[PDB]
mmCIF file of C-alpha atoms in Angstrom:
data_model
loop_
_atom_site.group_PDB
_atom_site.id
_atom_site.type_symbol
_atom_site.label_atom_id
_atom_site.label_comp_id
_atom_site.label_asym_id
_atom_site.label_seq_id
_atom_site.Cartn_x
_atom_site.Cartn_y
_atom_site.Cartn_z
ATOM 1 C CA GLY A 1 34.434 135.012 88.281
ATOM 2 C CA UNK A 2 37.290 133.359 90.008
ATOM 3 C CA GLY A 3 39.874 135.390 87.357
ATOM 4 C CA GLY A 4 38.771 138.969 86.652
ATOM 5 C CA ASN A 5 35.601 139.289 84.490
ATOM 6 C CA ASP A 6 35.398 141.375 81.225
ATOM 7 C CA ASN A 7 32.335 143.512 81.418
ATOM 8 C CA UNK A 8 30.176 145.833 78.863
ATOM 9 C CA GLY A 9 33.135 144.779 76.073
ATOM 10 C CA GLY B 1 32.587 131.154 86.122
ATOM 11 C CA UNK B 2 35.856 129.722 87.571
ATOM 12 C CA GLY B 3 38.016 131.828 84.770
ATOM 13 C CA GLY B 4 37.159 135.392 83.847
ATOM 14 C CA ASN B 5 33.857 135.721 82.098
ATOM 15 C CA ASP B 6 33.372 137.364 78.788
ATOM 16 C CA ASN B 7 29.917 139.799 78.921
ATOM 17 C CA UNK B 8 27.962 142.041 76.678
ATOM 18 C CA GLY B 9 30.575 141.150 73.522
ATOM 19 C CA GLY C 1 36.129 138.854 90.641
ATOM 20 C CA UNK C 2 39.180 137.265 92.551
ATOM 21 C CA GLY C 3 42.193 139.225 89.719
ATOM 22 C CA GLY C 4 41.220 142.629 88.733
ATOM 23 C CA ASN C 5 37.782 142.788 86.695
ATOM 24 C CA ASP C 6 37.844 144.997 83.767
ATOM 25 C CA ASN C 7 34.269 147.395 83.539
ATOM 26 C CA UNK C 8 32.641 149.776 81.004
ATOM 27 C CA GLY C 9 35.552 148.438 78.447
ATOM 28 C CA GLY D 1 43.464 138.578 77.752
ATOM 29 C CA UNK D 2 39.647 139.097 77.622
ATOM 30 C CA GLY D 3 38.848 137.249 81.528
ATOM 31 C CA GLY D 4 41.777 136.367 83.662
ATOM 32 C CA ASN D 5 43.149 132.623 84.166
ATOM 33 C CA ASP D 6 43.224 130.125 87.176
ATOM 34 C CA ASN D 7 46.430 128.666 87.706
ATOM 35 C CA UNK D 8 47.408 126.049 90.390
ATOM 36 C CA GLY D 9 43.801 126.601 92.648
ATOM 37 C CA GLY E 1 45.845 142.152 80.770
ATOM 38 C CA UNK E 2 41.866 143.159 80.448
ATOM 39 C CA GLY E 3 41.096 140.860 84.107
ATOM 40 C CA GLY E 4 44.011 139.976 86.217
ATOM 41 C CA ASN E 5 45.031 136.311 86.641
ATOM 42 C CA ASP E 6 44.897 133.577 90.024
ATOM 43 C CA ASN E 7 48.099 132.209 90.566
ATOM 44 C CA UNK E 8 48.771 129.897 93.422
ATOM 45 C CA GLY E 9 45.008 130.451 95.474
ATOM 46 C CA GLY F 1 48.102 145.732 83.189
ATOM 47 C CA UNK F 2 44.035 146.559 82.959
ATOM 48 C CA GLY F 3 42.977 144.298 86.817
ATOM 49 C CA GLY F 4 46.129 143.050 88.811
ATOM 50 C CA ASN F 5 46.891 139.688 89.586
ATOM 51 C CA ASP F 6 46.662 137.555 92.813
ATOM 52 C CA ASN F 7 50.205 135.809 93.476
ATOM 53 C CA UNK F 8 50.481 133.082 96.499
ATOM 54 C CA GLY F 9 47.083 134.245 98.248
ATOM 55 C CA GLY G 1 14.464 132.605 96.090
ATOM 56 C CA UNK G 2 15.581 131.600 100.012
ATOM 57 C CA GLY G 3 19.441 130.728 97.989
ATOM 58 C CA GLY G 4 20.806 132.974 95.541
ATOM 59 C CA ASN G 5 20.876 133.209 91.411
ATOM 60 C CA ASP G 6 24.135 132.879 89.501
ATOM 61 C CA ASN G 7 23.598 135.199 86.363
ATOM 62 C CA UNK G 8 25.381 135.228 83.018
ATOM 63 C CA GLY G 9 28.908 133.038 84.637
ATOM 64 C CA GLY H 1 15.963 136.860 98.458
ATOM 65 C CA UNK H 2 17.178 135.589 101.838
ATOM 66 C CA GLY H 3 21.014 134.692 99.892
ATOM 67 C CA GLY H 4 22.848 137.055 97.509
ATOM 68 C CA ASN H 5 22.515 137.073 93.551
ATOM 69 C CA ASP H 6 25.875 137.254 91.454
ATOM 70 C CA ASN H 7 25.440 138.916 88.626
ATOM 71 C CA UNK H 8 27.430 139.237 85.542
ATOM 72 C CA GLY H 9 30.553 137.148 87.288
ATOM 73 C CA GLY I 1 27.095 128.580 96.322
ATOM 74 C CA UNK I 2 29.095 130.904 94.146
ATOM 75 C CA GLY I 3 25.326 133.521 94.413
ATOM 76 C CA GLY I 4 24.404 133.516 98.298
ATOM 77 C CA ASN I 5 23.385 130.454 100.137
ATOM 78 C CA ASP I 6 20.431 129.791 102.896
ATOM 79 C CA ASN I 7 21.311 128.594 106.224
ATOM 80 C CA UNK I 8 19.568 126.356 109.093
ATOM 81 C CA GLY I 9 15.495 126.956 107.863
ATOM 82 C CA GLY J 1 25.764 124.419 94.033
ATOM 83 C CA UNK J 2 27.490 126.779 91.953
ATOM 84 C CA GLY J 3 23.696 129.419 92.368
ATOM 85 C CA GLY J 4 22.521 129.385 96.221
ATOM 86 C CA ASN J 5 21.670 126.365 98.300
ATOM 87 C CA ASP J 6 18.989 125.454 100.886
ATOM 88 C CA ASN J 7 20.303 123.983 104.153
ATOM 89 C CA UNK J 8 18.657 122.129 107.187
ATOM 90 C CA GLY J 9 14.689 122.566 105.949
ATOM 91 C CA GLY K 1 28.405 132.622 98.652
ATOM 92 C CA UNK K 2 30.891 134.818 96.519
ATOM 93 C CA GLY K 3 27.123 137.554 96.741
ATOM 94 C CA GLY K 4 25.675 137.366 100.565
ATOM 95 C CA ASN K 5 24.518 134.600 102.222
ATOM 96 C CA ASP K 6 21.786 133.785 105.046
ATOM 97 C CA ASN K 7 22.574 132.602 108.160
ATOM 98 C CA UNK K 8 20.705 130.817 111.381
ATOM 99 C CA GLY K 9 16.681 131.370 109.641
ATOM 100 C CA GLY L 1 17.604 141.210 100.185
ATOM 101 C CA UNK L 2 18.630 139.955 103.585
ATOM 102 C CA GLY L 3 22.656 138.924 101.923
ATOM 103 C CA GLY L 4 24.013 141.400 99.750
ATOM 104 C CA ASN L 5 24.389 141.461 95.743
ATOM 105 C CA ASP L 6 27.692 140.956 93.593
ATOM 106 C CA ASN L 7 27.425 142.875 90.463
ATOM 107 C CA UNK L 8 29.479 143.203 87.488
ATOM 108 C CA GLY L 9 32.265 140.864 89.195
ATOM 109 C CA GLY M 1 19.255 142.658 72.516
ATOM 110 C CA UNK M 2 18.716 142.799 76.297
ATOM 111 C CA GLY M 3 14.456 143.561 76.757
ATOM 112 C CA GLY M 4 11.773 144.672 78.904
ATOM 113 C CA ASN M 5 11.917 144.709 82.937
ATOM 114 C CA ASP M 6 14.229 141.717 84.313
ATOM 115 C CA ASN M 7 14.282 141.026 88.235
ATOM 116 C CA UNK M 8 17.376 138.989 87.308
ATOM 117 C CA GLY M 9 16.341 138.347 92.249
ATOM 118 C CA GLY N 1 21.818 146.688 74.398
ATOM 119 C CA UNK N 2 20.587 146.550 78.060
ATOM 120 C CA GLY N 3 16.661 147.676 78.397
ATOM 121 C CA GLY N 4 13.810 148.695 80.885
ATOM 122 C CA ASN N 5 14.258 148.699 84.651
ATOM 123 C CA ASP N 6 16.232 145.989 86.255
ATOM 124 C CA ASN N 7 16.206 145.455 90.051
ATOM 125 C CA UNK N 8 19.432 143.345 89.837
ATOM 126 C CA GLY N 9 18.274 142.463 94.230
ATOM 127 C CA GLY O 1 24.121 150.677 76.382
ATOM 128 C CA UNK O 2 23.141 150.741 79.892
ATOM 129 C CA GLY O 3 18.925 151.896 80.049
ATOM 130 C CA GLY O 4 16.272 152.813 82.623
ATOM 131 C CA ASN O 5 16.447 153.318 86.474
ATOM 132 C CA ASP O 6 18.380 150.250 87.997
ATOM 133 C CA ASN O 7 18.211 149.573 91.978
ATOM 134 C CA UNK O 8 21.543 147.475 91.651
ATOM 135 C CA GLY O 9 20.033 146.618 96.054
ATOM 136 C CA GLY P 1 41.984 116.548 103.703
ATOM 137 C CA UNK P 2 45.587 117.928 103.395
ATOM 138 C CA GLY P 3 43.368 121.060 100.414
ATOM 139 C CA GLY P 4 40.679 123.025 102.676
ATOM 140 C CA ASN P 5 37.390 121.237 103.211
ATOM 141 C CA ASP P 6 34.042 122.879 102.111
ATOM 142 C CA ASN P 7 31.152 122.724 104.351
ATOM 143 C CA UNK P 8 27.442 124.002 105.223
ATOM 144 C CA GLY P 9 27.271 123.572 101.124
ATOM 145 C CA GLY Q 1 42.732 120.390 106.597
ATOM 146 C CA UNK Q 2 46.688 121.684 106.378
ATOM 147 C CA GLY Q 3 44.546 124.422 103.314
ATOM 148 C CA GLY Q 4 41.781 126.972 105.314
ATOM 149 C CA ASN Q 5 38.438 125.361 105.786
ATOM 150 C CA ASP Q 6 35.246 126.781 104.529
ATOM 151 C CA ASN Q 7 32.214 126.509 107.062
ATOM 152 C CA UNK Q 8 28.608 128.290 107.748
ATOM 153 C CA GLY Q 9 28.458 127.633 103.500
ATOM 154 C CA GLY R 1 37.642 122.826 92.916
ATOM 155 C CA UNK R 2 34.646 124.529 95.001
ATOM 156 C CA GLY R 3 37.076 121.850 98.200
ATOM 157 C CA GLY R 4 40.677 122.735 98.303
ATOM 158 C CA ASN R 5 42.958 121.868 95.823
ATOM 159 C CA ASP R 6 46.384 119.851 96.300
ATOM 160 C CA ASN R 7 49.500 120.712 94.533
ATOM 161 C CA UNK R 8 53.272 120.119 94.259
ATOM 162 C CA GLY R 9 52.140 116.390 95.306
ATOM 163 C CA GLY S 1 43.744 123.996 109.237
ATOM 164 C CA UNK S 2 47.712 125.279 109.528
ATOM 165 C CA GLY S 3 45.531 128.539 106.039
ATOM 166 C CA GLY S 4 42.960 130.698 108.200
ATOM 167 C CA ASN S 5 39.561 128.886 108.386
ATOM 168 C CA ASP S 6 36.259 130.601 107.199
ATOM 169 C CA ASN S 7 33.212 130.657 109.589
ATOM 170 C CA UNK S 8 29.768 132.079 109.866
ATOM 171 C CA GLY S 9 29.791 131.826 105.674
ATOM 172 C CA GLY T 1 39.180 126.785 95.463
ATOM 173 C CA UNK T 2 36.112 128.429 97.640
ATOM 174 C CA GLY T 3 38.567 125.503 100.843
ATOM 175 C CA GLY T 4 41.907 126.558 100.972
ATOM 176 C CA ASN T 5 44.397 125.492 98.344
ATOM 177 C CA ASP T 6 47.534 123.564 99.150
ATOM 178 C CA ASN T 7 50.939 124.462 97.631
ATOM 179 C CA UNK T 8 54.804 123.617 97.536
ATOM 180 C CA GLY T 9 53.491 120.038 98.421
ATOM 181 C CA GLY U 1 40.515 130.580 97.982
ATOM 182 C CA UNK U 2 37.682 131.951 100.170
ATOM 183 C CA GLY U 3 39.619 129.338 103.390
ATOM 184 C CA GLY U 4 43.697 130.165 103.629
ATOM 185 C CA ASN U 5 45.984 129.373 101.196
ATOM 186 C CA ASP U 6 48.823 127.155 102.262
ATOM 187 C CA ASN U 7 52.168 127.886 100.455
ATOM 188 C CA UNK U 8 56.162 127.121 100.710
ATOM 189 C CA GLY U 9 54.816 123.573 101.528
ATOM 190 C CA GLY V 1 38.068 109.596 124.682
ATOM 191 C CA UNK V 2 41.833 108.068 124.198
ATOM 192 C CA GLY V 3 42.693 110.478 121.027
ATOM 193 C CA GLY V 4 40.441 113.234 119.871
ATOM 194 C CA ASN V 5 38.064 113.691 116.736
ATOM 195 C CA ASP V 6 37.890 115.972 113.872
ATOM 196 C CA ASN V 7 34.438 117.353 113.287
ATOM 197 C CA UNK V 8 33.809 119.403 109.871
ATOM 198 C CA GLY V 9 37.787 119.789 108.830
ATOM 199 C CA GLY W 1 38.808 113.898 127.590
ATOM 200 C CA UNK W 2 41.854 112.135 127.253
ATOM 201 C CA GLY W 3 43.425 114.323 123.624
ATOM 202 C CA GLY W 4 40.906 117.577 122.646
ATOM 203 C CA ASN W 5 38.686 117.763 119.483
ATOM 204 C CA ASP W 6 38.946 119.696 116.561
ATOM 205 C CA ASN W 7 35.318 121.318 115.783
ATOM 206 C CA UNK W 8 34.726 123.363 112.500
ATOM 207 C CA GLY W 9 38.805 124.172 111.457
ATOM 208 C CA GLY X 1 38.835 117.725 130.290
ATOM 209 C CA UNK X 2 42.238 115.948 130.117
ATOM 210 C CA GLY X 3 43.713 118.600 126.684
ATOM 211 C CA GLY X 4 41.341 121.444 125.692
ATOM 212 C CA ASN X 5 39.407 121.625 122.077
ATOM 213 C CA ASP X 6 39.527 123.638 119.087
ATOM 214 C CA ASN X 7 36.123 125.183 118.558
ATOM 215 C CA UNK X 8 35.760 127.372 115.068
ATOM 216 C CA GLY X 9 39.607 128.060 114.275
ATOM 217 C CA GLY Y 1 19.242 124.068 113.115
ATOM 218 C CA UNK Y 2 22.648 123.536 115.101
ATOM 219 C CA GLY Y 3 19.820 122.981 117.961
ATOM 220 C CA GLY Y 4 19.801 120.947 121.343
ATOM 221 C CA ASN Y 5 22.228 120.481 124.264
ATOM 222 C CA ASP Y 6 25.430 120.051 122.356
ATOM 223 C CA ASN Y 7 28.771 120.076 123.672
ATOM 224 C CA UNK Y 8 31.513 120.856 121.081
ATOM 225 C CA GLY Y 9 33.966 117.719 123.184
ATOM 226 C CA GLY Z 1 18.083 119.648 111.143
ATOM 227 C CA UNK Z 2 21.679 119.342 112.650
ATOM 228 C CA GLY Z 3 19.159 118.481 115.964
ATOM 229 C CA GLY Z 4 19.186 116.336 118.961
ATOM 230 C CA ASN Z 5 21.415 116.246 122.002
ATOM 231 C CA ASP Z 6 25.120 115.789 119.482
ATOM 232 C CA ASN Z 7 28.259 115.870 121.442
ATOM 233 C CA UNK Z 8 30.746 116.761 118.687
ATOM 234 C CA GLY Z 9 33.635 113.356 120.499
ATOM 235 C CA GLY a 1 20.255 128.181 115.474
ATOM 236 C CA UNK a 2 23.319 127.599 117.134
ATOM 237 C CA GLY a 3 20.402 127.029 120.035
ATOM 238 C CA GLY a 4 20.502 125.202 123.095
ATOM 239 C CA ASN a 5 22.697 124.754 126.325
ATOM 240 C CA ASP a 6 25.645 124.261 124.519
ATOM 241 C CA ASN a 7 29.526 124.203 125.786
ATOM 242 C CA UNK a 8 32.134 125.200 123.341
ATOM 243 C CA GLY a 9 34.644 121.314 125.731
ATOM 244 C CA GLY b 1 47.242 110.428 112.117
ATOM 245 C CA UNK b 2 44.438 112.720 110.825
ATOM 246 C CA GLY b 3 42.116 112.189 114.677
ATOM 247 C CA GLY b 4 44.266 111.594 117.849
ATOM 248 C CA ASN b 5 46.560 108.330 117.816
ATOM 249 C CA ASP b 6 46.850 106.008 120.654
ATOM 250 C CA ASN b 7 50.616 105.407 121.593
ATOM 251 C CA UNK b 8 52.662 102.868 123.825
ATOM 252 C CA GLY b 9 48.887 101.072 124.968
ATOM 253 C CA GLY c 1 48.136 114.456 115.246
ATOM 254 C CA UNK c 2 45.215 116.553 113.859
ATOM 255 C CA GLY c 3 42.872 116.011 117.694
ATOM 256 C CA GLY c 4 45.061 115.596 120.980
ATOM 257 C CA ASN c 5 47.095 112.409 120.821
ATOM 258 C CA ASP c 6 47.401 109.984 123.783
ATOM 259 C CA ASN c 7 50.698 109.085 124.705
ATOM 260 C CA UNK c 8 52.992 106.820 127.117
ATOM 261 C CA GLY c 9 49.264 105.074 128.140
ATOM 262 C CA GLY d 1 48.714 117.976 118.252
ATOM 263 C CA UNK d 2 46.026 120.482 116.838
ATOM 264 C CA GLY d 3 43.268 119.844 120.463
ATOM 265 C CA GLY d 4 45.277 119.312 123.787
ATOM 266 C CA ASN d 5 47.976 116.259 123.861
ATOM 267 C CA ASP d 6 47.633 113.847 126.967
ATOM 268 C CA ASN d 7 51.145 112.763 127.688
ATOM 269 C CA UNK d 8 53.064 110.630 130.367
ATOM 270 C CA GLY d 9 49.543 108.949 131.080
ATOM 271 C CA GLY e 1 60.941 120.723 85.807
ATOM 272 C CA UNK e 2 58.324 123.509 85.709
ATOM 273 C CA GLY e 3 61.403 125.002 82.768
ATOM 274 C CA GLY e 4 61.545 127.282 79.996
ATOM 275 C CA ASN e 5 59.668 131.111 79.649
ATOM 276 C CA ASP e 6 56.351 130.290 80.593
ATOM 277 C CA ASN e 7 53.877 132.967 81.646
ATOM 278 C CA UNK e 8 50.849 131.882 84.270
ATOM 279 C CA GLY e 9 47.900 134.014 81.223
ATOM 280 C CA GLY f 1 62.636 124.233 89.162
ATOM 281 C CA UNK f 2 59.726 127.054 88.881
ATOM 282 C CA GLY f 3 63.365 128.127 86.173
ATOM 283 C CA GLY f 4 63.096 130.663 83.560
ATOM 284 C CA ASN f 5 61.680 134.326 82.613
ATOM 285 C CA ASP f 6 58.465 133.448 83.865
ATOM 286 C CA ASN f 7 55.809 136.359 84.864
ATOM 287 C CA UNK f 8 53.073 135.164 87.052
ATOM 288 C CA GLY f 9 50.133 137.344 84.209
ATOM 289 C CA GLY g 1 64.339 127.254 92.245
ATOM 290 C CA UNK g 2 61.504 130.106 92.111
ATOM 291 C CA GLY g 3 64.859 131.481 89.730
ATOM 292 C CA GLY g 4 64.829 133.973 86.576
ATOM 293 C CA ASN g 5 63.671 137.328 86.153
ATOM 294 C CA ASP g 6 60.163 136.703 87.062
ATOM 295 C CA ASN g 7 57.977 139.731 87.670
ATOM 296 C CA UNK g 8 54.808 138.795 90.144
ATOM 297 C CA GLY g 9 51.804 140.819 87.089
ATOM 298 C CA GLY h 1 53.231 113.435 101.464
ATOM 299 C CA UNK h 2 51.646 112.599 104.814
ATOM 300 C CA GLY h 3 56.215 112.133 105.926
ATOM 301 C CA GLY h 4 58.243 114.873 104.280
ATOM 302 C CA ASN h 5 58.396 115.548 100.322
ATOM 303 C CA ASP h 6 61.584 116.755 97.931
ATOM 304 C CA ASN h 7 60.726 119.535 95.697
ATOM 305 C CA UNK h 8 62.017 121.225 92.551
ATOM 306 C CA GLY h 9 65.461 118.544 92.265
ATOM 307 C CA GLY i 1 66.722 112.498 104.489
ATOM 308 C CA UNK i 2 66.401 115.801 102.463
ATOM 309 C CA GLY i 3 62.164 115.359 103.644
ATOM 310 C CA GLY i 4 61.016 114.420 107.280
ATOM 311 C CA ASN i 5 59.647 111.123 108.695
ATOM 312 C CA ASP i 6 56.454 110.760 110.131
ATOM 313 C CA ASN i 7 56.840 107.857 113.110
ATOM 314 C CA UNK i 8 54.162 106.068 114.920
ATOM 315 C CA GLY i 9 51.273 108.525 113.113
ATOM 316 C CA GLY j 1 54.000 116.701 104.523
ATOM 317 C CA UNK j 2 52.532 116.128 107.919
ATOM 318 C CA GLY j 3 57.072 115.848 109.039
ATOM 319 C CA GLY j 4 59.185 118.503 107.506
ATOM 320 C CA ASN j 5 59.671 118.849 103.487
ATOM 321 C CA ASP j 6 62.391 120.166 101.410
ATOM 322 C CA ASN j 7 62.210 123.194 99.213
ATOM 323 C CA UNK j 8 63.498 124.845 95.914
ATOM 324 C CA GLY j 9 67.024 121.986 95.628
ATOM 325 C CA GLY k 1 67.732 115.809 107.979
ATOM 326 C CA UNK k 2 67.459 119.264 105.892
ATOM 327 C CA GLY k 3 62.819 118.758 106.859
ATOM 328 C CA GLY k 4 61.854 117.973 110.624
ATOM 329 C CA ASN k 5 60.657 114.503 111.947
ATOM 330 C CA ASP k 6 57.218 114.215 113.432
ATOM 331 C CA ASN k 7 57.205 111.468 116.028
ATOM 332 C CA UNK k 8 54.791 109.296 118.191
ATOM 333 C CA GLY k 9 51.763 112.052 116.347
ATOM 334 C CA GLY l 1 55.249 120.366 107.282
ATOM 335 C CA UNK l 2 53.235 119.610 110.611
ATOM 336 C CA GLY l 3 57.738 119.375 112.200
ATOM 337 C CA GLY l 4 60.113 121.949 110.613
ATOM 338 C CA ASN l 5 60.659 122.503 106.976
ATOM 339 C CA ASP l 6 63.499 123.473 104.993
ATOM 340 C CA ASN l 7 63.267 126.253 102.487
ATOM 341 C CA UNK l 8 64.953 127.760 99.214
ATOM 342 C CA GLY l 9 68.126 124.736 98.934
ATOM 343 C CA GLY m 1 68.410 118.991 111.646
ATOM 344 C CA UNK m 2 68.347 122.487 109.460
ATOM 345 C CA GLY m 3 64.045 122.125 110.532
ATOM 346 C CA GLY m 4 62.654 121.248 113.767
ATOM 347 C CA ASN m 5 61.267 117.905 115.270
ATOM 348 C CA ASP m 6 57.608 117.504 116.445
ATOM 349 C CA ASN m 7 57.899 114.999 119.471
ATOM 350 C CA UNK m 8 54.902 113.403 121.560
ATOM 351 C CA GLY m 9 52.249 115.655 119.470
ATOM 352 C CA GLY n 1 58.990 95.861 123.753
ATOM 353 C CA UNK n 2 61.326 98.858 121.939
ATOM 354 C CA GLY n 3 65.233 97.439 121.184
ATOM 355 C CA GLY n 4 68.561 99.202 120.664
ATOM 356 C CA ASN n 5 69.379 102.257 119.447
ATOM 357 C CA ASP n 6 67.253 103.843 117.098
ATOM 358 C CA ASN n 7 67.726 107.446 115.269
ATOM 359 C CA UNK n 8 63.894 107.663 114.457
ATOM 360 C CA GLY n 9 66.170 111.255 111.697
ATOM 361 C CA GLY o 1 59.486 99.324 127.131
ATOM 362 C CA UNK o 2 61.242 102.620 125.605
ATOM 363 C CA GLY o 3 65.299 100.991 125.185
ATOM 364 C CA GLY o 4 68.727 102.121 124.461
ATOM 365 C CA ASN o 5 69.853 106.047 123.163
ATOM 366 C CA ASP o 6 67.265 107.579 120.640
ATOM 367 C CA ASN o 7 68.377 110.816 118.933
ATOM 368 C CA UNK o 8 64.565 111.136 117.895
ATOM 369 C CA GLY o 9 66.693 114.684 115.213
ATOM 370 C CA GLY p 1 58.909 102.878 130.514
ATOM 371 C CA UNK p 2 61.462 106.024 128.842
ATOM 372 C CA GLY p 3 65.131 104.439 128.611
ATOM 373 C CA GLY p 4 68.727 105.800 127.892
ATOM 374 C CA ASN p 5 69.950 109.370 127.084
ATOM 375 C CA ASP p 6 67.413 110.929 124.202
ATOM 376 C CA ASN p 7 68.836 113.922 122.089
ATOM 377 C CA UNK p 8 64.795 114.557 121.173
ATOM 378 C CA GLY p 9 67.466 117.697 118.565
#
């Protein structure tokens, strides 16, 4: 999501 | 979502 | 997710 | 921190 | 930290 | 740290 | 459905 | 469905 | 389309 | 379209 | 499309 | 589904 | 949250 | 969270 | 989190 | 132009 | 142009 | 954006 | 152009 | 973005 | 991005 | 004829 | 004829 | 004829 | 689509 | 679409 | 698609 | 001169 | 001159 | 001159 | 210009 | 220019 | 230019 | 600049 | 003169 | 710059 | 002159 | 620059 | 002159 | 036309 | 046309 | 045309 995403927290 | 997104918190 | 993503924390 | 950024792109 | 960044791209 | 970065690409 | 769905981003 | 789905990004 | 697209019908 | 688009009908 | 696309119908 | 799915990125 | 059987598709 | 049987597809 | 039988496909 | 063009959507 | 072009979506 | 960006003029 | 082109999506 | 970027002019 | 980038002009 | 053309770029 | 053309690039 | 063409590049 | 007796110049 | 005896100059 | 008696110049 | 130019006639 | 140029006629 | 040029006629 | 202890996130 | 102790994230 | 103790993440 | 530019003074 | 001159284009 | 540019002074 | 000159293109 | 450029002064 | 000259192209 | 000693430079 | 001693440079 | 002693250089 064009920069690193931050999933599951 | 054009910058890293922040999912599940 | 165009930079390293951050999964499961 | 918590999603990366999009600097010049 | 917590997702990388996109510097010039 | 915690995902790498994308410098010029 | 003859596209692609963009979910949570 | 004749595309590709982009989920959590 | 950031999800998959549908080309030529 | 940021989701998948439909091209030529 | 950042997901898989569909080419020529 | 005749594409590819991009999950958590 | 997040309820049921989603075909997120 | 995250409920049911998702066909994330 | 992360619930059920996902066919992430 | 002289920034990459974006065709077929 | 003179930035790579983006065809077939 | 989604058309190539044009930096350093 | 003079940046690599991106065909067949 | 998703069209090649154009840096250092 | 996803079209080759164009650095050092 | 007499200079070429620029079709999609 | 008399200069070539630039088709998709 | 009289200069070649540039098809997909 | 991209249909007919076309001839790229 | 992109239909008929077209000839890219 | 990419259909017909085409001839790339 | 972004299409072939026409010099000295 | 981004398509073949036409020099000295 | 990104397609074949046409020098001295 | 583009002067100081900056840090691109 | 592009001067100082910068650190691209 | 591109001057100082920089460190590409 | 479509002529040469001057970067960082 | 610390650029480049673009003449007749 | 479509002529030569000048980088870092 | 510390660039390059683009003549007749 | 489409002519030769000048890099780092 | 510390570049390269692009003549008739 | 085209008169004198030009340093087209 | 084309007169004198040009240092086209 | 084409007159004198050119140092095309």
